[PDB]
RNA sequence: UUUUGAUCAACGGACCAAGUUACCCUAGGGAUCGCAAUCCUAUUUAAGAGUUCAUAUCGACAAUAGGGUUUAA
C-alpha cells in the first residue's frame with residue numbers, strides 16, 4: 001500500500017498570430033479519490049505509471065481562446081497520503097471526493113508574450129496508504145506478535161520462526177461483546193536502533209506513525225535473548241525500543257502505547273516475571289529518556305493464558321482517547 | 322498638293338446612353354497534392370543521467386507519423 005506514480009502536465013496550445021490571441025492552458029493532473037479497492041488497481045492494473053493530461057487547444061481562426069485543455073485524473077484509495085518524490089507531503093485524500101493538483105498543466109501558449117508554447121510540468125509523486133490502524137503492534141523479532149494476533153482474531157497470521165519474517169503488516173480486527181471492532185496490525189520484528197536504516201530499517205516503521213496507539217510485546221524469552229552475538233536483557237530491550245522510536249520520530253514516543261508481556265507459560269519465565277516486575281518502575285541499574293506507560297499485563301500466547309484480560313485494557317485506553 | 326486628327330485602352334473601334342426590381346414578365350436552358358521556417362504532440366532512438374526490502378525511471382538528439390503557425394489578391 002506504498003506504491004509510486006509519475007505524471008506529466010499537458011502542454012499549452014500555441015497561439016494564432018495576427019490577433020488570434022492566447023492558447024489553452026495545458027491539462028492538469030488531479031489525483032482523485034475512489035473506492036478504497038482502487039489501491040490494488042493502481043499498483044497492479046495499468047502497469048505503466050505515467051499519467052499524462054491533454055495539452056491545451058491551440059488558438060483557432062476568429063481569435064477563439066484556448067479550450068483550457070483536458071485534465072487527467074488518477075483514482076486513489078480513501079485515506080491515502082500524497083507525498084512528493086523527496087518525501088514532502090503534498091496532501092492526503094482522507095475523505096472521498098478529494099482531489100489534489102499534484103501536477104500543473106503547461107501554461108497556455110500565448111504568442112504576444114515571450115513564450116509561444118510552454119510544456120506541462122511533470123514529476124514523480126509517491127502515493128502511500130500506510131495502514132491507519134486503531135492501534136499498532138511493535139516488537140522485536142520472535143516476540144510473538146503474530147502468535148498474539150493469531151489467538152485474538154482468526155487471520156491465520158504468518159508465524160515468524162526466524163527474524164526478518166512477516167515483512168508485510170497483516171491487519172486484524174478484534175471483535176468484542178460490545179460489538180466494537182478494533183484493528184490491530186502486526187509488523188515484522190524491528191532491529192535495535194534502525195535510525196540509520198540498518199537491516200529492516202524504519203521504512204516499514206512509517207505504518208506505526210498512522211496508528212493511534214502502540215502495542216509493545218515483551219517476550220520473556222526475549223529477556224537475554226541470544227540475538228546471535230551479545231545477548232540483550234528485556235530491560236535493555238524496552239529502553240532500546242523507546243530510544244529507537246524517539247530517534248525516528250519524537251511524536252511516536254509521545255503517542256499512547258501499551259505493554260504486553262509474552263511467553264510467561266514457562267516456569268523459568270514465571271521467575272523472570274518477578275524480574276520483569278522488578279525491572280523498571282523502581283530505578284534499576286541502568287546499562288534515551290524513555291517513556292513507561294505502565295499498561296503492562298502478564299499473558300502467554302500458545303497457551304492462551306490471560307489473553308482476555310489484555311483485551312479489556314486495550315479497549316479502555318481506546319475509549320479514553 | 323502635300324499633310325494632320327483617339328487610354329476609339331471594351332485596344333477589328335456603335336458619333337452620343339447609368340441604377341433597380343422580393344411588384345415583375347416572356348422565350349428557353351439547367352438543376353429539382355505541393356516546399357520550406359519554427360512549434361507542438363505519438364511510436365521507435367537513447368546522449369545521458371539514473372536509479373534503491375508489496376519502491377524509479379525519466380530522458381538529449383534523431384528518426385518517423387499527426388495538428389498548428391509563419392510562408393501568397
Ligand SMILES: Nc1nc2c(ncn2[C@@H]2O[C@H](COP(=O)(O)OP(=O)(O)NP(=O)(O)O)[C@@H](O)[C@H]2O)c(=O)[nH]1
Pocket residue numbers: 139140141142143144145146147148158159160161162163164165166187188189190262263264265266300301302303
Ligand atoms: N513458549 C512460547 N513460545 C511462543 C510463544 N509465542 C510464540 N512462541 C514461539 O515462538 C516462535 C516465534 O514466532 P513468533 O514470535 O510467534 O512470531 P512473530 O511474533 O511474528 N515474530 P516477529 O517479532 O519477527 O514479527 C513461534 O513460532 C512459536 O513457536 C509463547 O507465548 N510461548
Ligand SMILES: [Mg+2]
Pocket residue numbers: 331
Ligand atoms: Mg468590345
Ligand SMILES: [Mg+2]
Pocket residue numbers: none
Ligand atoms: Mg476586340
Ligand SMILES: [Mg+2]
Pocket residue numbers: none
Ligand atoms: Mg488580332
Ligand SMILES: [Mg+2]
Pocket residue numbers: 343
Ligand atoms: Mg418585400
Ligand SMILES: [Mg+2]
Pocket residue numbers: none
Ligand atoms: Mg411593395
